[PDB]
């Protein structure tokens, strides 16, 4: 199968530069466009450009010539884009999608920014009598971290039923939290295994807390 | 640019209905090639975009059957047969024709169904936050619809104003409900001078409020 494998989440200060990275597999990279796209809310989905990596051949939108540099190396079959002169209106998520769109990678979260990273503290929501009929609730709580994003999981991604994770949410003061839960039955109460996974990549922070009854 | 107008913004739907988003280019797509570069992509939230059409009316492998594609020159239509539960998300239209290539600005479709009383559950603070300085109380609201709801705090039989947050999840890409979590927030002096904590919900489902409670010590 076609895979567009993009580099980690970055935090950098105003005036740098990045270079964000789209591993390739499963076709003959030298053969298909590379395309670079933007995403961000107010402005939409925006086409950066594009690369030929059999030739270097590239087409920019021209509201991006000036920011992103297109690069590739057949070598290891990866695409780079560069974004320099870095300011606030860039934050954003980046996408690599090949040919007219047809596989994209899973994107790569820029924020622009003069804060440092701060990592989540993970609470356990812990089920008790007071968390109905025959269903009880448990959940992990992520707290005060910056920036985005955040990765969260339930037994490494073998729970997915009746898991439930809420958006991230910016608050005033100017981290993030956000929370996971699972919905289960009440005999599933202190008997099954729940570890909520937490990975806080900028931060170095990953968590694997075990939600047991208080 | 080639703008990209996509009609309607929100399109909401009854389970096993027909749904239809349309799309219009401010210049010809048709390419001095023969084809026309029309795709269309759904974006689930938290995830990459995903072709589901091509070529204005090929299918993408695994895309389902109820989804067609149609039209030519600036105007074009992506239909669904019947939605189903999954096929929730933002969908955009996208030309390749032109320099530079340009998207819609997306068109979220959102299911439509019956009422749904929510199930609701309360979480005192967890010893590891509060040996760590702080307290969060939090309320939860399971798998209900509409969206809307009304969530009280009272501390000590006190109205609460002003000290909490609600956020709400993406609709359910299986039943098409929601769910919605509140947090209050307060001091740990502040909640270890304190005894009982109760979230009220009200909600069109509910004949009556429910209402979760802890007393704290009391466990
Ligand atoms: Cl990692
Ligand atoms: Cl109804």
């Known amino acids: 199968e076609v895979q567009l494998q993009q580099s980690g989440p970055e935090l950098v200060k105003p005036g740098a530069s990045v270079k964000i990275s789209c591993k390739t597999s499963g076709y003959t990279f030298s053969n298909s466009w590379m395309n670079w796209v933007k995403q961000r809310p107010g402005q939409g989905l925006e086409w950066i450009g594009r690369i030929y990596p059999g030739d270097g051949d590239t087409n920019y939108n021209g509201k991006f010539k000036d920011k992103a540099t297109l690069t590739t190396d057949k070598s290891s079959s990866t695409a780079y884009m560069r974004l320099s002169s870095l300011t606030s209106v860039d934050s954003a998520v980046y996408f690599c999608?090949?040919?007219?769109?047809?596989?994209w990678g899973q994107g790569t979260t820029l924020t622009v920014s003069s804060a440092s990273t701060k990592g989540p503290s993970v609470f356990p929501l812990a089920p008790s009598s007071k968390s109905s009929g025959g269903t009880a609730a448990l959940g992990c709580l992520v707290k005060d971290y910056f920036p985005e994003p955040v990765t969260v999981s339930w037994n490494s991604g073998a729970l997915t039923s009746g898991v439930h994770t809420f958006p991230a949410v910016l608050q005033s003061s100017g981290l993030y939290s956000l929370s996971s839960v699972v919905t289960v039955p009440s005999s599933s109460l202190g008997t099954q295994t729940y570890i909520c996974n937490v990975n806080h990549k900028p931060s170095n922070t990953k968590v694997d807390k075990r939600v047991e009854p208080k | 640019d080639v703008v990209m107008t996509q009609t309607p913004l929100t399109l909401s739907v009854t389970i096993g209905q027909p749904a239809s988003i349309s799309c219009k280019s401010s210049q010809s797509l048709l390419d001095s090639d023969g084809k026309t570069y029309l795709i269309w992509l759904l974006q689930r939230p938290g995830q990459s975009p995903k072709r589901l059409i091509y070529?204005?009316?090929k299918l993408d492998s695994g895309v389902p059957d109820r989804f067609t594609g149609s039209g030519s020159g600036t105007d074009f239509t992506l239909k669904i047969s019947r939605v189903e539960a999954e096929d929730l998300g933002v969908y955009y239209c996208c030309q390749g024709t032109h320099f530079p290539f340009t998207f819609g600005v997306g068109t979220k479709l959102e299911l439509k169904r019956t009422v749904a009383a929510p199930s609701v559950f309360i979480f005192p603070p967890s010893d590891e936050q509060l040996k760590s300085g702080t307290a969060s109380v939090v309320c939860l609201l399971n798998n209900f619809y509409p969206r809307e709801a009304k969530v009280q705090w009272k501390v000590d039989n006190a109205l609460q104003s002003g000290n909490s947050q609600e956020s709400v999840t993406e609709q359910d890409s299986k039943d098409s409900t929601y769910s919605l979590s509140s947090t209050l927030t307060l001091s740990k002096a502040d909640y270890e001078k304190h005894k009982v904590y109760a979230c009220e919900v009200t909600h069109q489902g509910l004949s009556s409020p429910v209402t979760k409670s802890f007393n704290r010590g009391e466990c």
């Open positions: 070529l204005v009316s």
């Open positions: 999608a090949r040919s007219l769109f047809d596989y």
